[PDB]
Homo-oligomer: A and B are copies of this chain.
Amino acid sequence: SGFRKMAFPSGKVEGCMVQVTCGTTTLNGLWLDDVVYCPRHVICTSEDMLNPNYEDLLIRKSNHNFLVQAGNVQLRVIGHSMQNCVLKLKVDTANPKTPKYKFVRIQPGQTFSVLACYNGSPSGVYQCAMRPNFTIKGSFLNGSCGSVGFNIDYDCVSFCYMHHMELPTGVHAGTDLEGNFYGPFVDRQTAQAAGTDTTITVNVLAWLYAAVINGDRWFLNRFTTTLNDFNLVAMKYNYEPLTQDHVDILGPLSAQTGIAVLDMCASLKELLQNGMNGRTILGSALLEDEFTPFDVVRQCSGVTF
């Protein structure tokens, strides 16, 4: 029993973190085989960030302008190239700790673990979700750029996020490992903002199933709803629309508890319209939306890596 925001074990990712320095700018890099991946803004000064021409900044650099440090060992850069907003530094040494890995781009609503890093040294690990507005509610200070987000499946690390920046509201923005930003953001110091966010409905339903699995059933009722009537209510409370794909994804949780998805939707509809009335669900007074159906199944089954 119990239900916590659980992150994947970070060991396989810890063995990939390095420090990348270009001039006076320092940040983190991901060392996989003989390549170090990092945010391309490492080549910018504070002045350059207002309006950078990355190809013009990069052409003026040589391999020896990049200092890469793995623990207390200096790696020698022997090549460099840019792919979207990521810089790829070819180094003289392959990482002996390179795990089996893939680069995957995730969709809004999906969760991943973040290994926060400073000066190439891991400091902590936490779980988060890609919000519908493409930002993440992370915990990052200056020096954290280059920290990565990932999921694990058996022995394979699927890297999905590389940290680039913080927005005025304190939320974060970054790219996939191919350098493509999540959301309408650019790597330049210009006026940028998080758009209006919505609640990940399929995830709230998944967490209500987790609460029923863990003994919390007070919110269940005799009612059901159609998918269209539910979506009309959800739209009014800034919840994402629930699709038939979302209903299908909730199938295994619906089968394990014996509660049909539309039956759980009628419970969520009543919670949206009335509230919790002084009660909590899994120790929370808010409807939690950063646990996917898969996260609930994995935690309530004991899947190992």
Residue contact A137 to B283, C-beta cutoff 8 Å? yes
Q: A304 to chain B: which residues have CB within 8 Å?
A: 117-119, 121-123
Known: A124-B8, A286-B280. A2 touches B301 (CB 8 A): no
Check: A271 CB closer than 8 A to any chain B CB.
no
Check: A108 CB closer than 8 A to any chain B CB.
no
Q: A298 to chain B: which residues have CB within 8 Å?
A: 123-124
Question: From residue A76, how far is it (CB to closest CB) to chain B in Å?
Answer: 24
Question: From residue A75, how far is it (CB to closest CB) to chain B in Å?
Answer: 19
CB-defined interface of A135-149 with B at 8 Å, one 1/0 digit per residue? Answer: 001111101100000
Q: A195 to chain B: which residues have CB within 8 Å?
A: none
Q: A303 to chain B: which residues have CB within 8 Å?
A: 123
Check: A294 CB closer than 8 A to any chain B CB.
no
Q: A12 to chain B: which residues have CB within 8 Å?
A: 11
User: For window 1-49 of chain A, which residues contact chain B by CB distance below 8 Å?
Assistant: 1-12, 14-15
Question: From residue A254, how far is it (CB to closest CB) to chain B in Å?
Answer: 21
- Give residues in A with beta carbon < 8 Å to B: 1-12, 14-15, 115-119, 121-128, 137-141, 143-144, 166, 170-172, 214-215, 280, 283-286, 298-305
Among the listed B9, B172, B286, which residue makes an inter-chain contact with A285, where contact means beta carbons less than 8 Å apart?
A: B286
Residue contact B6 to A5, C-beta cutoff 8 Å? no
Give A141 to B3 CA distance when docked, in angstroms: 10
Known: A9-B115, A10-B11, A302-B144. A138 touches B215 (CB 8 A): no
Residue contact A170 to B6, C-beta cutoff 8 Å? no
Q: A1 to chain B: which residues have CB within 8 Å?
A: 139-141, 166, 170
Question: From residue A180, how far is it (CB to closest CB) to chain B in Å?
Answer: 23
Q: A123 to chain B: which residues have CB within 8 Å?
A: 9, 298, 302-305
Residue contact A124 to B284, C-beta cutoff 8 Å? no
Give A301 to B143 CA distance when docked, in angstroms: 11
A sample of 30 inter-chain contacts (CB < 8 A) reads: A1-B170, A2-B137, A2-B138, A2-B172, A4-B126, A4-B127, A4-B128, A4-B137, A4-B139, A6-B124, A6-B125, A6-B139, A7-B124, A7-B126, A9-B10, A9-B115, A10-B10, A11-B14, A116-B302, A118-B302, A121-B304, A122-B304, A123-B304, A124-B299, A125-B125, A139-B299, A141-B301, A170-B215, A284-B285, A285-B286
Specify the chain B residue showing the minimal Cβ separation from A9.
B122
